[PDB]
Design an enzyme around this catalytic site. Structure first.
Site, PDB file in Angstrom:
ATOM      1  N   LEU A   1      -9.299   3.796   2.961  1.00 40.36           N
ATOM      2  CA  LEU A   1      -9.992   4.320   1.965  1.00 40.36           C
ATOM      3  C   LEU A   1     -10.871   5.348   2.775  1.00 40.36           C
ATOM      4  O   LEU A   1     -11.418   5.087   3.704  1.00 40.36           O
ATOM      5  CB  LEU A   1     -10.810   3.515   1.355  1.00 40.36           C
ATOM      6  CG  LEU A   1     -12.106   4.044   0.441  1.00 40.36           C
ATOM      7  CD1 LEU A   1     -11.436   4.788  -0.545  1.00 40.36           C
ATOM      8  CD2 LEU A   1     -13.012   3.186   0.261  1.00 40.36           C
TER       9      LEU A   1
ATOM     10  N   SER B   1     -12.190 -20.049  -6.169  1.00 44.28           N
ATOM     11  CA  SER B   1     -10.795 -20.106  -5.675  1.00 44.28           C
ATOM     12  C   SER B   1     -10.801 -20.493  -4.261  1.00 44.28           C
ATOM     13  O   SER B   1      -9.617 -21.281  -3.774  1.00 44.28           O
ATOM     14  CB  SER B   1     -10.296 -18.687  -5.585  1.00 44.28           C
ATOM     15  OG  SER B   1     -10.385 -18.047  -6.894  1.00 44.28           O
TER      16      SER B   1
ATOM     17  N   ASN C   1      -6.781 -19.902 -10.995  1.00 44.03           N
ATOM     18  CA  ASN C   1      -8.215 -19.318 -10.953  1.00 44.03           C
ATOM     19  C   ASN C   1      -8.184 -17.987 -10.301  1.00 44.03           C
ATOM     20  O   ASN C   1      -8.986 -16.889 -10.887  1.00 44.03           O
ATOM     21  CB  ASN C   1      -9.042 -20.394 -10.068  1.00 44.03           C
ATOM     22  CG  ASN C   1     -10.605 -19.841 -10.070  1.00 44.03           C
ATOM     23  OD1 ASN C   1     -10.898 -19.033  -9.353  1.00 44.03           O
ATOM     24  ND2 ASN C   1     -11.254 -20.291 -11.110  1.00 44.03           N
TER      25      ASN C   1
ATOM     26  N   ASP D   1      -6.535   6.574  -4.596  1.00 44.59           N
ATOM     27  CA  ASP D   1      -5.849   5.180  -4.891  1.00 44.59           C
ATOM     28  C   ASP D   1      -5.967   4.870  -6.598  1.00 44.59           C
ATOM     29  O   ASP D   1      -6.504   5.647  -7.343  1.00 44.59           O
ATOM     30  CB  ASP D   1      -6.546   4.337  -4.072  1.00 44.59           C
ATOM     31  CG  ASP D   1      -7.964   3.670  -4.333  1.00 44.59           C
ATOM     32  OD1 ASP D   1      -8.470   4.451  -5.307  1.00 44.59           O
ATOM     33  OD2 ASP D   1      -8.510   3.123  -3.869  1.00 44.59           O
TER      34      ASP D   1
ATOM     35  N   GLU E   1       0.623  -1.242  -0.128  1.00 45.77           N
ATOM     36  CA  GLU E   1       0.151   0.178  -0.074  1.00 45.77           C
ATOM     37  C   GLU E   1       0.694   1.076   0.064  1.00 45.77           C
ATOM     38  O   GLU E   1       0.383   2.251  -0.497  1.00 45.77           O
ATOM     39  CB  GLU E   1      -1.166  -0.020   1.170  1.00 45.77           C
ATOM     40  CG  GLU E   1      -1.936  -1.202   1.178  1.00 45.77           C
ATOM     41  CD  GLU E   1      -3.076  -1.132  -0.058  1.00 45.77           C
ATOM     42  OE1 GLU E   1      -2.992   0.054  -0.695  1.00 45.77           O
ATOM     43  OE2 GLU E   1      -3.922  -2.050  -0.186  1.00 45.77           O
TER      44      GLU E   1
END
Ligand SMILES: [Cl-]
Ligand SMILES: [Cl-]
EC number: 3.2.1.17
Length: 162
Positions: A32, A117, A132, A20, A11
């Site tokens: 966020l 997945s 996947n 972002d 990040e």
């Protein structure tokens, strides 16, 4: 290496409001603030989160405090999720961190959506899950990050981060 160091590499750290990868107002270590297009709305959300009139800038300490909260929230979100938890419980320590990284980035709901997945991970079919995982918007939009997370699931080591 651990979840914090892992997510700090993924990040970054910015002490001023920024947008972002998706164009959303964020600050600190991937925190966020809002999906709203308005900078004021972001600033308001920021002040409310910090508890002071920040004027869009925070200190390192403040960024680290939101980060601890967000990591704690992701873990508790996984443990509360009927879909995620059993996966989470079946994994080793390293792979658990990969799952936390995903939830941190895309939210619990988001991840809970990788049905196929998740099943593969639960079954310890690593290569298949990796394949996947790659057929996703996630991988296509943020491939370098996605690839580090995928290698972590595939191998069970932190090599992608060293
Ligand atoms: Cl908050
Ligand atoms: Cl990326």
């Amino acid at each position: 290496m651990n979840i914090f160091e892992m997510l700090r590499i993924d990040e970054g750290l910015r002490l001023k409001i920024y947008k972002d990868t998706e164009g959303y107002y964020t600050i600190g270590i991937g925190h966020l603030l809002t999906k709203s297009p308005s900078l004021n709305a972001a600033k308001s959300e920021l002040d409310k989160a910090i508890g002071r009139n920040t004027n869009g800038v925070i200190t390192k300490d403040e960024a680290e405090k939101l980060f601890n909260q967000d990591v704690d929230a992701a873990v508790r979100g996984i443990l509360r999720n009927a879909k995620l938890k059993p996966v989470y419980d079946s994994l080793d320590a390293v792979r658990r961190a990969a799952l936390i990284n995903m939830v941190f980035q895309m939210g619990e709901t988001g991840v809970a959506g990788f049905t196929n997945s998740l099943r593969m991970l639960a079954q310890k079919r690593w290569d298949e899950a990796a394949v996947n995982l790659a057929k996703s918007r996630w991988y296509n939009q943020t491939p370098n990050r996605a690839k580090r997370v995928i290698t972590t699931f595939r191998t069970g080591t932190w090599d992608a981060y060293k």
